[PDB]
Structures are given as C-alpha cells and as structure tokens.
Amino acid sequence: DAMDITVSIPPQQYFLEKIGGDLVRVSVLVPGNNDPHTYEPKPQQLAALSEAEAYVLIGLGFEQPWLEKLKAANANMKLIDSAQGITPLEMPGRLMVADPHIWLSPTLVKRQATTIAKELAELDPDNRDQYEANLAAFLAELERLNQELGQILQPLPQRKFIVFHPSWAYFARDYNLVQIPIEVEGQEPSAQELKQLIDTAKENNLTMVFGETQFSTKSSEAIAAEIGAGVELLDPLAADWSSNLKAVAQKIANANSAQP
C-alpha cells in the first residue's frame, strides 16, 4: 500500500517515482500530449483528489489556473511547492512573471527532488530512509546527466536554437544556450516579429526550427521552410525525463555543430 500523490505534469511522475519508488502511487493531472497553460482539470480528476495525500506543484504560478480547484477538491491535501528556495527567471519578454520551466534543468531538479523527498518523509516518517536514499541516488544520476549534457553542448559553435515555445530557458541558461522563441505568451503584438526571426535565422545560419510536441507545427514548418531549415520536436512534458533531455541536447548539437 503506497502513498497517493498527485502531480501536475508527467515529468514530475518521473521525479516522484525516483524518490518515492513503490512507496507512492502517482497520478498526473495534465496528460503529456496536453497543453498545461490551457488545461482544465476534469470532474473525475477533481473527485480523485479526495484520495490525494498530497499534490506536488511545479510552482512559480504553473498551477495558477487550477490551484483553487485543487484546494476546493481537498483542503486536507498537502501542497508541495517543489519550486521553493529557487531563484526564478523572468519570462522571455515581461519580467513581472517568473518562468515555471525549472523541471527542465538537471541542476535545479536536484532542489525540486530534495523538497519532494523532504515532504514525502514528513507524511510518511517510517520510510524516511528510503526517501533519503532514493533521493541521494537520483541526485547522483542528476550530476551524471548534467555532466553528460554539458559535454554535448559545450563545444557547439552555435549557441542559439529556434524554439516554437520558450520552454527551455533554464536548460538553456545552464548550458550557455540562447533560445529564439517563435511565440511567447503575453507580448506586445508584432506581426512582423517572425520576419525578423527568419532574417536573423538566415544570417546566423540556424539550421533547425524546434517546435513543441504538444503544439501544431504549421507555423514552425512555415518558418522553417523560409529559413531553409528543418523541423524537429522538443518535448518538455516527456515522461522519460532523463533520456529526453539527452535527445534534446543531441537535437541541438546536431543543429548547432559545424554542418556537413
């Protein structure tokens, strides 16, 4: 009999599984092929929260749209801000709002897991050793992944990569990359912004356009077709978090290395 913990997105299930093991039974609120920004929890999901012993929030206003429905679905449900203690990054354009995509940084994930481990232990003291051990193990894996991604992205001549959505600001900062976002939410309307991106893309010789897995690629392909580049997807909600960050680092490396 495990502990019922609910999380917002699939990447967190990877996290809770690494820390909780068979000590927790994880449920995800947002399906991996869904857009969290415009996501609406379903009645059945809200009812299931009555059994949730806790809910692990990404933090930084990620749950903002459903937070209240959560507290209304189960007030006795423990809310775990796995983003606490971490210094955010302002969103691409406006600074007023902090960027929630910290789950995509191996180094920051070390802090998010620590917090999760800590809270899971307070709720279930008997297994404090397991949470602490699992945590220590995951932590080592994180440094291994961070060092592996580093070497992959360190030598690249091109540090910029075109993304349909700026979901990789943290990942980018960690490894000295700069994302060029096609579409950022909450920005001063600039219909010709994509013309500026394409011209800049051609002058820098950006070879690829990376769309987001949960979104249409029409605009990306169209932009790509103009830059004379190719299209690939980058999935920030991937369940296989670790292997995915590497696939992502490899996509970047493939596009940002001296081209054949």
Side-chain angles (χ1 to χ4, degrees):
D1 208 309
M3 197 170 252
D4 270 298
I5 273 66
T6 300
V7 295
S8 298
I9 53 168
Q12 295 181 291
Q13 170 152 48
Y14 181 84
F15 300 162
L16 270 280
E17 222 71 59
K18 284 287 179 175
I19 297 167
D22 60 9
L23 283 175
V24 298
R25 194 179 309 136
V26 188
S27 290
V28 195
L29 187 64
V30 186
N33 39 29
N34 280 224
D35 172 17
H37 193 298
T38 71
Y39 191 71
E40 190 87 4
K42 315 309 162 180
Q44 197 185 308
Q45 291 186 294
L46 300 171
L49 289 166
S50 68
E51 309 292 289
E53 220 140 314
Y55 186 106
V56 184
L57 314 157
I58 265 79
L60 303 177
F62 187 82
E63 288 78 27
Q64 171 62 304
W66 346 297
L67 224 187
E68 275 315 308
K69 302 207 194 69
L70 296 182
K71 299 213 273 293
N74 191 336
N76 311 308
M77 175 182 82
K78 176 66 197 180
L79 301 190
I80 309 170
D81 186 339
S82 67
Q84 71 175 68
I86 308 172
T87 309
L89 289 181
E90 336 174 308
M91 279 297 282
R94 50 224 291 281
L95 45 71
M96 62 173 112
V97 171
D99 192 319
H101 308 86
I102 56 172
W103 72 81
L104 294 172
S105 160
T107 299
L108 260 47
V109 167
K110 298 189 173 179
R111 223 304 127 206
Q112 296 150 63
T114 299
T115 305
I116 299 169
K118 176 181 185 297
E119 299 308 327
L120 279 159
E122 293 181 1
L123 287 170
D124 190 36
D126 292 348
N127 303 304
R128 191 180 194 76
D129 60 314
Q130 302 217 201
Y131 297 108
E132 297 209 351
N134 291 341
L135 191 272
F138 183 24
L139 281 176
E141 288 161 45
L142 283 165
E143 233 309 301
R144 220 126 55 214
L145 174 61
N146 167 41
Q147 289 298 313
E148 195 183 315
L149 294 168
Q151 303 166 207
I152 292 191
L153 283 0
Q154 193 292 316
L156 304 172
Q158 177 53 266
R159 315 309 304 173
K160 305 135 198 190
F161 61 110
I162 299 170
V163 296
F164 171 60
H165 276 181
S167 313
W168 317 77
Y170 288 97
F171 177 100
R173 274 277 174 284
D174 292 351
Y175 309 114
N176 304 140
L177 294 171
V178 183
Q179 58 183 179
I180 312 308
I182 295 302
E183 161 168 283
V184 296
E185 285 307 279
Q187 82 316 314
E188 309 300 351
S190 187
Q192 290 194 46
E193 63 183 59
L194 260 41
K195 179 59 166 54
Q196 189 180 307
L197 180 152
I198 292 177
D199 299 332
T200 296
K202 295 176 182 172
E203 305 168 2
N204 296 295
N205 191 202
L206 302 196
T207 70
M208 204 68 71
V209 167
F210 298 103
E212 191 144 281
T213 300
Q214 295 75 206
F215 293 88
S216 184
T217 53
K218 271 287 204 68
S219 55
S220 288
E221 290 157 359
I223 297 299
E226 272 299 319
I227 311 173
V231 177
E232 262 164 357
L233 300 174
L234 289 197
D235 187 10
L237 298 175
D240 202 23
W241 185 78
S242 180
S243 305
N244 185 242
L245 282 199
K246 283 177 282 190
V248 169
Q250 201 54 61
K251 291 266 190 59
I252 301 295
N254 283 5
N256 291 197
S257 304
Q259 303 297 298

PDB file of all heavy atoms in Angstrom, residues 202-224:
ATOM      1  N   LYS A 202      18.551  33.357 -40.955  1.00  0.00           N
ATOM      2  CA  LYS A 202      19.334  33.131 -42.163  1.00  0.00           C
ATOM      3  C   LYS A 202      20.741  33.710 -42.069  1.00  0.00           C
ATOM      4  O   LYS A 202      21.673  33.163 -42.632  1.00  0.00           O
ATOM      5  CB  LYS A 202      18.633  33.748 -43.376  1.00  0.00           C
ATOM      6  CG  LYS A 202      17.292  33.124 -43.745  1.00  0.00           C
ATOM      7  CD  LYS A 202      16.635  33.878 -44.899  1.00  0.00           C
ATOM      8  CE  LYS A 202      15.269  33.299 -45.239  1.00  0.00           C
ATOM      9  NZ  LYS A 202      14.502  34.123 -46.226  1.00  0.00           N
ATOM     10  N   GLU A 203      20.895  34.820 -41.365  1.00  0.00           N
ATOM     11  CA  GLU A 203      22.204  35.441 -41.256  1.00  0.00           C
ATOM     12  C   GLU A 203      23.124  34.683 -40.313  1.00  0.00           C
ATOM     13  O   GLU A 203      24.345  34.709 -40.458  1.00  0.00           O
ATOM     14  CB  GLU A 203      22.050  36.887 -40.800  1.00  0.00           C
ATOM     15  CG  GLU A 203      21.126  37.677 -41.706  1.00  0.00           C
ATOM     16  CD  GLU A 203      20.743  39.005 -41.110  1.00  0.00           C
ATOM     17  OE1 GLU A 203      21.235  39.314 -39.999  1.00  0.00           O
ATOM     18  OE2 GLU A 203      19.958  39.738 -41.752  1.00  0.00           O
ATOM     19  N   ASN A 204      22.527  33.992 -39.351  1.00  0.00           N
ATOM     20  CA  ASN A 204      23.295  33.222 -38.380  1.00  0.00           C
ATOM     21  C   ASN A 204      23.434  31.782 -38.827  1.00  0.00           C
ATOM     22  O   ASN A 204      24.166  31.000 -38.221  1.00  0.00           O
ATOM     23  CB  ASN A 204      22.616  33.269 -37.011  1.00  0.00           C
ATOM     24  CG  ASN A 204      22.586  34.658 -36.439  1.00  0.00           C
ATOM     25  OD1 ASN A 204      23.626  35.245 -36.137  1.00  0.00           O
ATOM     26  ND2 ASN A 204      21.389  35.205 -36.300  1.00  0.00           N
ATOM     27  N   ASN A 205      22.726  31.454 -39.900  1.00  0.00           N
ATOM     28  CA  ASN A 205      22.725  30.111 -40.468  1.00  0.00           C
ATOM     29  C   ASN A 205      22.080  29.069 -39.540  1.00  0.00           C
ATOM     30  O   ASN A 205      22.545  27.935 -39.466  1.00  0.00           O
ATOM     31  CB  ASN A 205      24.156  29.668 -40.808  1.00  0.00           C
ATOM     32  CG  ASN A 205      24.193  28.393 -41.640  1.00  0.00           C
ATOM     33  OD1 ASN A 205      25.204  27.686 -41.664  1.00  0.00           O
ATOM     34  ND2 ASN A 205      23.092  28.099 -42.335  1.00  0.00           N
ATOM     35  N   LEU A 206      21.021  29.448 -38.827  1.00  0.00           N
ATOM     36  CA  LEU A 206      20.365  28.490 -37.952  1.00  0.00           C
ATOM     37  C   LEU A 206      19.758  27.443 -38.854  1.00  0.00           C
ATOM     38  O   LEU A 206      18.964  27.744 -39.749  1.00  0.00           O
ATOM     39  CB  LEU A 206      19.285  29.142 -37.097  1.00  0.00           C
ATOM     40  CG  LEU A 206      19.771  30.290 -36.219  1.00  0.00           C
ATOM     41  CD1 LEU A 206      18.713  30.552 -35.165  1.00  0.00           C
ATOM     42  CD2 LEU A 206      21.110  29.960 -35.566  1.00  0.00           C
ATOM     43  N   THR A 207      20.139  26.203 -38.592  1.00  0.00           N
ATOM     44  CA  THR A 207      19.738  25.060 -39.394  1.00  0.00           C
ATOM     45  C   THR A 207      18.462  24.349 -39.030  1.00  0.00           C
ATOM     46  O   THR A 207      17.957  23.546 -39.815  1.00  0.00           O
ATOM     47  CB  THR A 207      20.811  24.015 -39.321  1.00  0.00           C
ATOM     48  OG1 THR A 207      20.818  23.457 -37.998  1.00  0.00           O
ATOM     49  CG2 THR A 207      22.159  24.641 -39.593  1.00  0.00           C
ATOM     50  N   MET A 208      17.929  24.628 -37.855  1.00  0.00           N
ATOM     51  CA  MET A 208      16.756  23.905 -37.446  1.00  0.00           C
ATOM     52  C   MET A 208      15.748  24.779 -36.736  1.00  0.00           C
ATOM     53  O   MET A 208      16.088  25.836 -36.217  1.00  0.00           O
ATOM     54  CB  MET A 208      17.209  22.774 -36.529  1.00  0.00           C
ATOM     55  CG  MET A 208      16.274  21.599 -36.445  1.00  0.00           C
ATOM     56  SD  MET A 208      16.190  20.699 -37.990  1.00  0.00           S
ATOM     57  CE  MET A 208      17.813  19.917 -38.024  1.00  0.00           C
ATOM     58  N   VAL A 209      14.500  24.337 -36.753  1.00  0.00           N
ATOM     59  CA  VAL A 209      13.415  25.021 -36.071  1.00  0.00           C
ATOM     60  C   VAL A 209      12.858  23.938 -35.169  1.00  0.00           C
ATOM     61  O   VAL A 209      12.476  22.868 -35.649  1.00  0.00           O
ATOM     62  CB  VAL A 209      12.315  25.487 -37.039  1.00  0.00           C
ATOM     63  CG1 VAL A 209      11.074  25.908 -36.244  1.00  0.00           C
ATOM     64  CG2 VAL A 209      12.825  26.653 -37.883  1.00  0.00           C
ATOM     65  N   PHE A 210      12.839  24.199 -33.865  1.00  0.00           N
ATOM     66  CA  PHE A 210      12.353  23.206 -32.920  1.00  0.00           C
ATOM     67  C   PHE A 210      10.980  23.535 -32.374  1.00  0.00           C
ATOM     68  O   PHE A 210      10.839  24.422 -31.535  1.00  0.00           O
ATOM     69  CB  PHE A 210      13.329  23.052 -31.756  1.00  0.00           C
ATOM     70  CG  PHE A 210      14.689  22.582 -32.166  1.00  0.00           C
ATOM     71  CD1 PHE A 210      15.758  23.471 -32.241  1.00  0.00           C
ATOM     72  CD2 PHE A 210      14.910  21.240 -32.466  1.00  0.00           C
ATOM     73  CE1 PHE A 210      17.032  23.031 -32.606  1.00  0.00           C
ATOM     74  CE2 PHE A 210      16.176  20.787 -32.831  1.00  0.00           C
ATOM     75  CZ  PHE A 210      17.241  21.687 -32.901  1.00  0.00           C
ATOM     76  N   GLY A 211       9.968  22.813 -32.847  1.00  0.00           N
ATOM     77  CA  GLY A 211       8.610  23.048 -32.385  1.00  0.00           C
ATOM     78  C   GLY A 211       8.336  22.307 -31.097  1.00  0.00           C
ATOM     79  O   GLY A 211       9.125  21.454 -30.684  1.00  0.00           O
ATOM     80  N   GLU A 212       7.224  22.627 -30.449  1.00  0.00           N
ATOM     81  CA  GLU A 212       6.873  21.957 -29.204  1.00  0.00           C
ATOM     82  C   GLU A 212       5.921  20.807 -29.495  1.00  0.00           C
ATOM     83  O   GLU A 212       4.942  20.959 -30.225  1.00  0.00           O
ATOM     84  CB  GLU A 212       6.233  22.942 -28.230  1.00  0.00           C
ATOM     85  CG  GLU A 212       6.069  22.409 -26.825  1.00  0.00           C
ATOM     86  CD  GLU A 212       6.295  23.480 -25.780  1.00  0.00           C
ATOM     87  OE1 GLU A 212       7.476  23.790 -25.503  1.00  0.00           O
ATOM     88  OE2 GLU A 212       5.300  24.024 -25.242  1.00  0.00           O
ATOM     89  N   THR A 213       6.230  19.660 -28.907  1.00  0.00           N
ATOM     90  CA  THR A 213       5.480  18.433 -29.093  1.00  0.00           C
ATOM     91  C   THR A 213       3.966  18.500 -28.886  1.00  0.00           C
ATOM     92  O   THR A 213       3.213  17.802 -29.572  1.00  0.00           O
ATOM     93  CB  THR A 213       6.076  17.343 -28.197  1.00  0.00           C
ATOM     94  OG1 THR A 213       7.447  17.137 -28.567  1.00  0.00           O
ATOM     95  CG2 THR A 213       5.321  16.047 -28.350  1.00  0.00           C
ATOM     96  N   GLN A 214       3.522  19.348 -27.959  1.00  0.00           N
ATOM     97  CA  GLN A 214       2.098  19.499 -27.665  1.00  0.00           C
ATOM     98  C   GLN A 214       1.416  20.537 -28.539  1.00  0.00           C
ATOM     99  O   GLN A 214       0.242  20.843 -28.342  1.00  0.00           O
ATOM    100  CB  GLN A 214       1.883  19.884 -26.193  1.00  0.00           C
ATOM    101  CG  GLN A 214       2.300  18.829 -25.179  1.00  0.00           C
ATOM    102  CD  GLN A 214       3.811  18.727 -25.002  1.00  0.00           C
ATOM    103  OE1 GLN A 214       4.319  17.670 -24.633  1.00  0.00           O
ATOM    104  NE2 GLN A 214       4.529  19.828 -25.238  1.00  0.00           N
ATOM    105  N   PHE A 215       2.145  21.093 -29.498  1.00  0.00           N
ATOM    106  CA  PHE A 215       1.548  22.099 -30.366  1.00  0.00           C
ATOM    107  C   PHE A 215       1.675  21.767 -31.841  1.00  0.00           C
ATOM    108  O   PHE A 215       2.457  20.906 -32.239  1.00  0.00           O
ATOM    109  CB  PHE A 215       2.159  23.488 -30.106  1.00  0.00           C
ATOM    110  CG  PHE A 215       1.826  24.056 -28.751  1.00  0.00           C
ATOM    111  CD1 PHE A 215       2.627  23.772 -27.645  1.00  0.00           C
ATOM    112  CD2 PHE A 215       0.681  24.837 -28.570  1.00  0.00           C
ATOM    113  CE1 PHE A 215       2.289  24.255 -26.380  1.00  0.00           C
ATOM    114  CE2 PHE A 215       0.330  25.326 -27.309  1.00  0.00           C
ATOM    115  CZ  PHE A 215       1.131  25.036 -26.212  1.00  0.00           C
ATOM    116  N   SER A 216       0.877  22.462 -32.645  1.00  0.00           N
ATOM    117  CA  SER A 216       0.878  22.304 -34.094  1.00  0.00           C
ATOM    118  C   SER A 216       2.228  22.788 -34.608  1.00  0.00           C
ATOM    119  O   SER A 216       2.854  23.651 -33.997  1.00  0.00           O
ATOM    120  CB  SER A 216      -0.250  23.145 -34.705  1.00  0.00           C
ATOM    121  OG  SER A 216      -0.344  22.952 -36.098  1.00  0.00           O
ATOM    122  N   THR A 217       2.662  22.242 -35.740  1.00  0.00           N
ATOM    123  CA  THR A 217       3.945  22.612 -36.332  1.00  0.00           C
ATOM    124  C   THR A 217       3.799  23.456 -37.590  1.00  0.00           C
ATOM    125  O   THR A 217       4.792  23.747 -38.258  1.00  0.00           O
ATOM    126  CB  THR A 217       4.741  21.371 -36.699  1.00  0.00           C
ATOM    127  OG1 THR A 217       3.924  20.524 -37.513  1.00  0.00           O
ATOM    128  CG2 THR A 217       5.159  20.625 -35.445  1.00  0.00           C
ATOM    129  N   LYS A 218       2.564  23.834 -37.911  1.00  0.00           N
ATOM    130  CA  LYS A 218       2.289  24.638 -39.095  1.00  0.00           C
ATOM    131  C   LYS A 218       3.198  25.863 -39.153  1.00  0.00           C
ATOM    132  O   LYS A 218       3.959  26.047 -40.106  1.00  0.00           O
ATOM    133  CB  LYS A 218       0.823  25.091 -39.103  1.00  0.00           C
ATOM    134  CG  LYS A 218      -0.157  24.145 -39.782  1.00  0.00           C
ATOM    135  CD  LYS A 218       0.003  24.184 -41.300  1.00  0.00           C
ATOM    136  CE  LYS A 218      -1.273  23.749 -42.032  1.00  0.00           C
ATOM    137  NZ  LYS A 218      -2.389  24.732 -41.852  1.00  0.00           N
ATOM    138  N   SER A 219       3.119  26.701 -38.127  1.00  0.00           N
ATOM    139  CA  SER A 219       3.939  27.898 -38.083  1.00  0.00           C
ATOM    140  C   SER A 219       5.424  27.546 -38.107  1.00  0.00           C
ATOM    141  O   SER A 219       6.215  28.230 -38.752  1.00  0.00           O
ATOM    142  CB  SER A 219       3.611  28.721 -36.837  1.00  0.00           C
ATOM    143  OG  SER A 219       3.731  27.958 -35.658  1.00  0.00           O
ATOM    144  N   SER A 220       5.807  26.476 -37.420  1.00  0.00           N
ATOM    145  CA  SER A 220       7.209  26.095 -37.399  1.00  0.00           C
ATOM    146  C   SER A 220       7.729  25.669 -38.769  1.00  0.00           C
ATOM    147  O   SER A 220       8.828  26.060 -39.172  1.00  0.00           O
ATOM    148  CB  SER A 220       7.454  24.981 -36.378  1.00  0.00           C
ATOM    149  OG  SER A 220       7.352  25.488 -35.062  1.00  0.00           O
ATOM    150  N   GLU A 221       6.937  24.868 -39.474  1.00  0.00           N
ATOM    151  CA  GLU A 221       7.302  24.377 -40.799  1.00  0.00           C
ATOM    152  C   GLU A 221       7.347  25.535 -41.772  1.00  0.00           C
ATOM    153  O   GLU A 221       8.224  25.617 -42.635  1.00  0.00           O
ATOM    154  CB  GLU A 221       6.269  23.361 -41.278  1.00  0.00           C
ATOM    155  CG  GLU A 221       6.298  22.043 -40.532  1.00  0.00           C
ATOM    156  CD  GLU A 221       4.975  21.297 -40.630  1.00  0.00           C
ATOM    157  OE1 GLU A 221       4.026  21.818 -41.264  1.00  0.00           O
ATOM    158  OE2 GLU A 221       4.878  20.185 -40.068  1.00  0.00           O
ATOM    159  N   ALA A 222       6.379  26.426 -41.629  1.00  0.00           N
ATOM    160  CA  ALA A 222       6.315  27.587 -42.490  1.00  0.00           C
ATOM    161  C   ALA A 222       7.561  28.446 -42.271  1.00  0.00           C
ATOM    162  O   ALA A 222       8.189  28.887 -43.234  1.00  0.00           O
ATOM    163  CB  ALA A 222       5.049  28.387 -42.195  1.00  0.00           C
ATOM    164  N   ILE A 223       7.915  28.681 -41.008  1.00  0.00           N
ATOM    165  CA  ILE A 223       9.087  29.482 -40.685  1.00  0.00           C
ATOM    166  C   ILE A 223      10.325  28.758 -41.182  1.00  0.00           C
ATOM    167  O   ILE A 223      11.216  29.351 -41.784  1.00  0.00           O
ATOM    168  CB  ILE A 223       9.227  29.686 -39.168  1.00  0.00           C
ATOM    169  CG1 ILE A 223       8.031  30.467 -38.642  1.00  0.00           C
ATOM    170  CG2 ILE A 223      10.520  30.425 -38.867  1.00  0.00           C
ATOM    171  CD1 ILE A 223       7.895  31.843 -39.249  1.00  0.00           C
ATOM    172  N   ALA A 224      10.352  27.458 -40.920  1.00  0.00           N
ATOM    173  CA  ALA A 224      11.456  26.595 -41.307  1.00  0.00           C
ATOM    174  C   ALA A 224      11.671  26.637 -42.811  1.00  0.00           C
ATOM    175  O   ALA A 224      12.800  26.808 -43.284  1.00  0.00           O
ATOM    176  CB  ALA A 224      11.162  25.179 -40.871  1.00  0.00           C
TER     177      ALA A 224
END
